[model samples]
Target chain A: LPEDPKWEFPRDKLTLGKPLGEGCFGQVVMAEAVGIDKDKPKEAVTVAVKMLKDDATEKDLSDLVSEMEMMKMIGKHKNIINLLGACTQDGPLYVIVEYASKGNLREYLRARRPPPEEQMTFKDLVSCTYQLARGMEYLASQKCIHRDLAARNVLVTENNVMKIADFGLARDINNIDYYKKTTNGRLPVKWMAPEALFDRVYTHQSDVWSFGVLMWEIFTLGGSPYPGIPVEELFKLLKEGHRMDKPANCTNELYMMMRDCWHAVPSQRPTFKQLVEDLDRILTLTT
Target chain B: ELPEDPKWEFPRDKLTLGKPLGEGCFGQVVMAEAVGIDPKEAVTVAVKMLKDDATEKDLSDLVSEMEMMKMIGKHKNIINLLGACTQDGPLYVIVEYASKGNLREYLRARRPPGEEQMTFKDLVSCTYQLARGMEYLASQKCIHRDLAARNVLVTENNVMKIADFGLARDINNIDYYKKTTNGRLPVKWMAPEALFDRVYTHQSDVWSFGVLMWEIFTLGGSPYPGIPVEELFKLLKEGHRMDKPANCTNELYMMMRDCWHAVPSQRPTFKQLVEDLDRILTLTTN
Candidate 1:
């Protein structure tokens, strides 16, 4: 990992481009960090700059800054939306991270209707899923729980490198690996585990449940899960022991792994380490 | 008396765009403060700016949409268009700004940091307000092609206003808007006729209002939680409608069911919707 660049970054050197999307907290724009020292040279790096709105409350600003500080502590990872640097002093509070060339993972998967020559092999699909597991394993080791983990929250580079984004940044870090929902926030209901849905309790195992949905998304090429059930009826269905049917193209081994992740009891779900190992075996079989 | 040729143009210089509040397919929805001509009073507004690359036809269609909004005029729950700026680099349509934000986010926020849940009375009241707004639009021969929780804005006092009339129109016949090949339509909230027959009418808006009611009762849950978009048609074809929300009373759920009736003629009119919801609100409060 690169040395922590934890102070006020060169604000004038950074330039912004068109917006990617608006988050609950602020706007995320395409940007570049120019003249940044990397590998003994002042190199410019392409990045995504998340800038807070002008009318943001004092509390919101501080929470954002603190979140970046925690990200700085977590350091760099290939599969995480790595925080390169931040500019908090001179202009609008900006948190800069490495840019994803292909935008969101969901949109990238949906738009992948290339000819037979450019199509991704099932082996590559397994590798991509493995990369995500490796990233989450690192996060799990750090005692971090990604409260929101969905295909939309993941970002993909041009080279098909998937990196997790828009997670736990605004949330407090030092709390337990488990996060309790404070009512005002909107939970991604379709991706959430049963415990998190009603009891307002979130754990790493709850994330495992979401990862099951993410795997389903990858196998189906980004199709919405459940296909006709209303959000209101989901809890009842889940209580009645209904899980998503296996994707048609998914290997039986991969489908079984997804089922393992969705164990009704949180403790029964596999750890990220187990997930990485299982995916590795699955990839070997396919190759 | 309504003018035969209504003045649609407003000076671009008089309107100043504020911070970006939200975004849509066309462009950003920014906070705007506009100065009125005769009164010269500055009013806070939300301007839905047309993208910089908007074609001439898009501009004309937008102007036509704004004109329709103006003809419908002011109502308590209906979000009236204040003015438009066609000469600007980014064309904009200015309307009243609600301080609180969209109904979905507002309902989500109401779920406090603790155990407190949103009261049934508030949910019924919001539904009643939306029904009144749709009643006004239906009476004016207007159909709000898109009427979801995300389109309704709430003020500080929790008064809901129907906003975002981008797909709205003043047509008596069941008209059809060409669907974009790439993007997903609001198929979840659309009536069966609108989805299958490609017919959009005021009755379709009523169907959307029912889905909106489910959203409120579920505290802003997604319409179809796990359902894939491709299978929605097949599921609806089998006469399947959304189940009642956990917190919803049988009366409200029945009303929601009535709106989802397969035949367009069987759906409740907005006037009837208003009366039924008002009665529910009264009884709940009592």
Candidate 2:
């Protein structure tokens, strides 16, 4: 067991890179952290800096810092772009997390499309899905429910190392609680489970429900779940037990595996642990 | 050190304050709705507001409590800090509200208009949950000191959320508080070492847990029933402990007494209590 690094990252110690991208509330930049990791105090480490927008409101900064606080609770995980430290005090707010050189898994799969779509065979799909379940299981173990589970929210390396980016960080960004009708996130409606859509009951099983959609995304080469269905007509159809049809390329067993994850009862859904084992079993058979 | 993050600060204007829910020596708790805090709709939250007639010592102590709660971080069973408003005037420590109210009231539930009482298992369940939560706090190297039923809140599905690890004693407490010349101690809940020498530790909390169990099984009955405060302290020093409630089983009653062991170190850890409670929960033909 190692000592946890200080949550407050000194700005003088962090050298920022030019803006790589900006999300709904903050700008992301590749940065350098000198001696921020508690173990190796003086070692310069590469990090992704997520800082509040220049003209963002005070409340916006507060909302962003809440995400940082949520990230702190999650601690570090191999399959997650773990939160390193932050510059909450003594500077413009900055949340520094692990910088995955490669970008989002959704974009990666999408970019590898057309001729390269078939290059994305069932084997790597199994590997990625399998790896993601392991990460989700870790999140479940820590009791941090990943309400938003999708390929877009996941980061991948060149070596196909899947890292869960912002597992339930959006909830804190939106501050999603036990209440309903309040959420205004550019919510992944299709990716969301029925219980989540209706009652706002987010748990690990609800994430598993979303994980089922994530699997469908992999099978379809990052195709949108329930293609062409308007979100207005989505919940009504979902309430009537409608589901995304099986992806053509993937085997029937894989489709079946993701299907039960959409079980009506939250407890009826397979836990991430069970999903991890099932995915692992499939991996062994494929190997 | 106090938390300096702006995340810990709230927009004072954004809070729509309500009447005070409970008051204490240092501050009064009020239910408030925070507007801009959440993304879509306002969130209903509890705010502990420091009284305007407070000393710097009071402010420092309150500040220290925030530091501790901030450091303690998040746990499902622990009351989570949802930032504060200390910028302008009085301090407002905002926290998530427990709708069902404190565990003490929940147990002594006034379902009195022809309602059934909680089963022994329900009582045991609350105790077991508290032990698990306490076990986590113990792992963090922090002692709760106040482990009474009042400090525990009943959330949905009877899940208990432990609250109030602050500098000020909750004045809402009726039967528990004991007054003294120099300072105050929760006399009935305190371990002998704590009550006498004022040496508080994890073991002292363990002692309080036993007293808390008495409250649970007895349906929020007062500890040391009918005994005067002066004799109560004398009785504890004289190696006397409260007798188990009439309905309490030997195993459960013995467990409480074990926590009241003269040597504070002799008491079981919260982890052990959790394991033992789990055993009780899993089986019960009686």
Candidate 3:
């Protein structure tokens, strides 16, 4: 791992507490870093430490370390997860990141629904989606691909701030629009592009496809996609140009934007920058 | 001589084909569900199927290719060929499903968000696994002419598997010399021996592994970025290779440098490469 001069905190200053949840890489544990900096030797800052498993292979450890390097590289962004510090010495490898009080967006929305009062307003939905679009737009500008983009992959702050998380499978791309798949692995079929599903090719457009699905999740309040179909059937249906029906109360404009993202040709899909502009236009008109 | 195994012969009727997963140079792969003998248990699998228009010669060639793969047999690091469905029009070569997709795509996806970084330890392990897989193939005297990041697969749990075994050798070999407008031969990864003399061996694969390590460290960045194919050809001919990727530890970068030695004999073998990476990874942990 690169010497994270700015982001690396002393491992000894960190104290782990209650377990939050298990991520694909490891367990997310709540922690506090006391006196990470010489200037603030007595200050204690709360954080969430995603600890790699004890049996994590050398490959797993390296993947986590590189992910930390990326977090530092991306620096600070409002709609992206904040990486506080990392531990690579003495104990199990752990990444200290900002804690999301409201938990992941999927669960947050699910718990608030079924009653009208707690239900998120249209403006709130649009705002959250807009924030995601803005964050993803920044990511796309950096030539990064969030292969896994979904509501569950996003964290929600108590102030209703949505930040993208889970960089487990993200990759930086050259100018190429399509990256061919060489592995046979499980994919979030409903949230994937036709090209990605059938051809094993992924680009920022594929992330756009997932953004549309995320919008669907927001509109439907985290409902399951392709209600009655098996995953095997879903990919086949997608190849035949099938798409989810518009969510209840979803506007024609929003639905259209989502439709634009599903274009069979990757090049035909709208870019994240365009999506951000369109989203901003929608917000101004509605607000 | 072909060794007979019941599990290697999958009945065509018992398989249910889903959607096309992806296409190779010669055939298309599809997501499939296998109805096991127990009847109650079904498992998802990847079925690499021959194209419908495959010639009789293609069919015979694939069968012989499978024989070669069988000779290499099964290993944890190598993509396991489960069985074959030969009684049908589209012959199927069933293999285990690697849920996380290809290593290249996986690494590419991990490049963004900055926080979701791939560690040096992970890069070393990936290289070590590839080397181990190649070592197994070399032990069997099998040369993986197409060993690159794109040719390797990974499981959701981070297990790396060597895929794209000599199945597409016919198309790949034919395309190796033909400089199409796009340059299909993955020249950045080809060893000089294979590039100049068309002589491919396990040593050549070691060279590709070095390029793959570069890809891993750079998080799927193109090898020799901005350098055109002809220029890259000239550059490599002049013994110029890529500079070390930013933040790649000195030791790991040296290992990669060793793999790209001008002489094939000078480059480390898979066994040696694995040992080198293991030592580096161990040193970092302590």
Candidate 4:
């Protein structure tokens, strides 16, 4: 593949613009792909390039490559992050991902803070959650768990279609813990469950709990958790068995869904497929 | 470095001497020293007085911080404590005066410098010193929950010492600490799971260090550049980091990259960070 100088890609076939943003793995950029079709003169597509640092161990590279592979293979749901392609040149690795032009849902929600007398109607929340659930349902159907689902991972287009992003954190239903790369045995504490917080394991059940936290992030326009609570106290509260509170203005239906996802016991939590049906039903109210 | 010997005690009468500098939800820091003593050596220390008005969570946080500070105080890699007043009114902690200012303000002032202000070597040294401090704290089974630039203090000698234990927590007896209702973990500099209200461990501190490195390089630029807190929270939820800026060294950039890994387990430990930053020192110095 020829690297284009304009994009600073090592090869011309991979011309890219400035970075849109960086994910856990690497940065996202908009690229002008010359061969979209011989018919279309020049097709510009936004793509993500996950270029690991030079020192990334083989295992690190493998884990990243697997994530890219999974995203490409499971390129199904309309509301899921789409993988354009991948690259393995320049410093041993680079992942080419589809670019979402409108930016992420977190940015949109953040921009509409305090809701401003209703930037989104009740119907909009229902619709958006439904779209998200639809994507979650598809992921569940494939037996994959999106361990990092949240408003940040969800990207919305101008007309408001939501898509799930970040496959690096996703794990198949069975092997979520198969690759436990430890930087001193840590876990992402923000969206994790009390049990996951305790056990450091991600089950379909824990994914449900994470979804509940995501609901809070989405509903509250990403307000800080338990605003004004000291950092240590926040963990102590969780360790003492307190799930995140439902956002102040969150809908009862949405709250109920979150509650189900937040069951103290993992077995009691609903599956993503179940959540999809429930979200679909909730959205159907408007229709 | 040898553990600093306890300095002159806080003269209780001096508590009323000067004006209060700043106050957060759980504590207040006052600009006071030994009253009536000379301005140069009368032990003009910054006293961060604790407030009990905090909720149960806040109280738990106070306890966790107190414990962390007590432990961190024993290590010379961190700031030396002059004295404390846990039993008295306005539970206070008196620390050695640091004229170099907080890391945030220093970094801010350093911004817009034409020449190589903080050489890449200085950045690596700072990272190593910070990591060494963290390594020491972690060994004591403590996590500097809010290990951001703002929490780091620069001594006149340019030594970066972490401060603001208001959010620090102890890993020892974590179960007991968890049961306490008042501690609130700082989420901005936290690991994803920790941000999602998951269990926080040493790795969470590493995540903060990642953002802290960004603060150092950007010279007080907001962590997760170009995005508001909401968007930062969002992208973090989706497992994204604001890419490293253009000018940062690859070594430093890589370290930041590893620190912000979506999977907390994938992050590097402080010891590893110490070593990594040390390697960059020679490159930077040359």
Candidate 5:
């Protein structure tokens, strides 16, 4: 078959593999990125290219562009998802991303053979939670709030290091409607901050609260937030100053930290920097 | 822009006789064929006719079907695009007829006698193909928000393709995805994160994939068959996952477990899932 020009190759040009997955915006293909500059020899590299769906609407195209712009704006941080490059040609929008060999954190945990507890050892817990904090710190440093931080959003590299992925729901700290649209948002209330619970304007402090819930997930071998309760009830409970129950095996300091993260007052909650310190302190005490 | 006209009308006179292929709250499936042409040229087709007096969501969803079919009708994995009828009160989506019908019916028919069946290999195959469909949709930046067994059409060769983009929307459609429901949503198959009506991201698709896994392994059994929707949501918020059916293999179980991860970010992407599932199949068959 003749090479199709409609398909947009990455900066490092190479052919694509079969699709890995797809959503409203586009399909992700395991493709090679070629250097646009013919003068560069080291330009050829393998990367995953997210090609926009043909049926994508104008609105979908705009969102795809926005995600690319946001990913680019966020730049290449340790935990935050990196942007390899982007392509939009002949009606197709493509984002060339780093090909994660180990795939996502959830897949690794599920495929992992262990003593169940082995997968979530205290050492691994502190380390992984720290990685999340690093990403959060990077976001806060840029005055950004990763409105949607969860296990699925954390991509595991081939080396077993976790990096936060997906900025589709992220917002700059200044977004006024950040929390006002929660009930209609894709973010769950269980992981939502107190102010976010009531559609209040949020800050980096609110993101710290979300991080506490993520910490819980890492310790639980990836459990859901507020398991066994209706979502509406979660909102009702949180409004009433109640959060989800802590795991039985959870440490007191960890429990205290989670509670502090959910302090009725956003200002009272620990900042991302404070969160890293608290996690480090607790891990040291336990280790 | 094309004028807003009722040009996409359902075929009024067609043979509509076939056993019930499938049924859901939105509509029913019946075997149909074009009436105006010679038998050789007019191949038998599957008629997905909406039930009378459907809800606004259903009506809006039907409109999306027309939009999606017009967009993706030519893709190979997608079912052959036949004409549609929207002029009439209830719409009719005439599609290429499948000899084996839907994945649900096929799985139900494939169940082993007397004992619970483990469709580890078959389920992985189905999921892999479905991932391809999703991969295609995502490449287009469109989210097929309501992907399930019923929406999948399988041919004799077991080629899986996604149908029903009515539930799909633009990539940033958190509005459409998290827009709350007045009635009880299908909780069993939904990921706990999205089930909470929080931010439903691309990973939300992973949660639905977990439910699809259960359905495939259990031979199309209702997801969380024993659990109520509210209780299921409670169970999710409480940080518990539905127990895999008895016959699930370790490899299949692992895939299912990952798909159901509590944190939306923890769930595997369709790419990882496709690779992993393919790997599991290789190990299983060898």
Candidate 6:
């Protein structure tokens, strides 16, 4: 999160192209940036740049910068989309990071549509969830909490590897003593923990709750979590122990693990490390 | 790191299954000891079979795949159909087994702790044989829609045998994506025409050959590293091929570029590639 001199990327090297997508803050555009990420600086490489909107509000500007800071703090991992460089000293703010060729996990899933039966094998689906679990495990090692962990927040690589993206809403658990959500602007309602939804609190365990729902999203081929249930009844029903049914084709054991993540008490939920282990075992058995 | 098996109808009882080798094009494959199938001494071959959950379409697809192998016939560089067990509970295809692992796996596994790089000479040599195999396939009016290094098997004598020549993807692979709209394809190695117009031909395979060769020179590295899947067709349409690897020879890199010519026919044929490699090997004699 510190403003290191290395974080400063030159605007001359960047050429913005078509828009990738717009979010709560601003839109991300596909671009070409030379002399970044890899050792080969002679030619330009593709990158995804997050830009702040023109005439941005003070809070929006701060949030965009905060997102860049969080990405840098998360560091590098095979599964996490690390920050490439940022254009802090520039005309328009550009937070450049590694590009994900396959877009988000949700779009990728829906693209395949009627289950993974024909296109992907069971191993492929399990491997996606396993990769996400591995990335989250790395995040925990860095003392970080991804406040929003959902299918849309994850990105897929050209080589079919799943990587965690969208650190904009992430918080460092180690630094600044502690943190919680009280009056939230916009949260991933379905993915949030009961503690996060009810009492407005968040911790490392809350991410586990979101991850459980993320797994459900993945297994159901990107179904909206708790489909057809309105947000008003969502928390009340979840409070009374109403869990989403097991995905039609998902194994019983995997469905049980998803429920394990939604345990009422935050500490009762399995850690990311444990989640990866369970996911790994299932993947190995399938092969 | 796996490849094939599919073929002529034979007695299913002839195959005595051994330990699992890996999953094949249609289903599970295992090394087996066969009796009298070859009509000689007891032979050890690979048996490819399907799981019980396999559907009618799965069985029909495998049947078609085996027939394609029968058409490909015998070639030094192609995986020949040894035999099959289609008149039984689950379909089975038995073919010659290469003692050494897959080509990509072979390339990736050999680097010891302190090494400058893997043997580029072997990489170049193996590709020459692959060109010959592809040339033979093209002659039979066959098109290998998928021709990545992962689909190649390495023989005990270090011969490269092209295997699993179909669109169906197997386990431990990112070979093909089954997209219902435009079409199913492994986009990274995909030819521009194959992606844009859903047109696949021997020339399309020739286009993919360039990317596959790039992977070989890099010692199993993926082609067009970090290039987005969404941009591949446009990039290739705009005539942008991947940059030559730091390890690649200029002569060899040039040959690779020729395979990527925008006009499919302009791209060198597999036979042309075979001749080109024959010369490039000596040019190294760049």
Query: What DockQ, on C-alphas, does every prediction get?
Result: 0.02, 0.01, 0.02, 0.05, 0.02, 0.01
Give the higher-lDDT candidate: 1 or 5.
Answer: 1
Stretches of model 6 off by over 4 angstroms after superposition: A1-3, A22-24, A115-118, A174-185, B1-286
* Candidate 1 per-residue C-alpha lDDT over A22-126 given as tens digits, one digit per residue, 9 for 90 to 100: 454556888777765466246777788876542233334455676676676664788998787777653456778878988787777777645413556688778
Worst 10 residues of 4 chain A by lDDT: A178-187
Error of 6 at A151 (Å): 0.6
- How accurate is chain B of model 6, given as a TM-score from 0 to 1? 0.86
Ten residues in a row with the worst lDDT in model 6 chain B?
A: B168-177
- lDDT by residue (A180-287, candidate 2, tens digit) is 554323345677778765675577787898899989888888797776564435667888989888998889898898889988888999999999999999999998
Q: After superposition, how far is residue A96 of candidate 2 from its true place, in Å?
A: 0.7
Best by lDDT: 6
What candidate 5 gets wrong by more than 4 Å, as runs, is A1-12, A21-26, A35-40, A54-57, A113-120, A178-184, A283-287, B1-286
Per-residue lDDT over A165-203 for candidate 4, one digit per residue giving the tens place of the 0 to 100 score: 877767677765543433112334456666654565667
Q: Between the candidate structures 5 and 6, which one is better when assessed by DockQ?
A: 5
What lDDT is reached at residue A90 by model 5? Answer: 31
Real contacts recovered, all predictions: 0.00, 0.00, 0.00, 0.00, 0.00, 0.00
Every candidate's lDDT: 0.75, 0.74, 0.73, 0.66, 0.64, 0.76
Model 5 agreement with the true structure over A183-206: per-residue lDDT tens digits: 324454566675664555667887
Clashing pairs in 6: B282-B285
Best by DockQ: 4
Q: Is the docking of candidate 1 incorrect, acceptable, medium or high quality?
A: incorrect
- Residue-by-residue lDDT tens digits, candidate 6, B82-174: 887654245677788887767777777775454244567777788889999989888887877678887899888889999875552222223
* Candidate 1, backbone clash total: 7
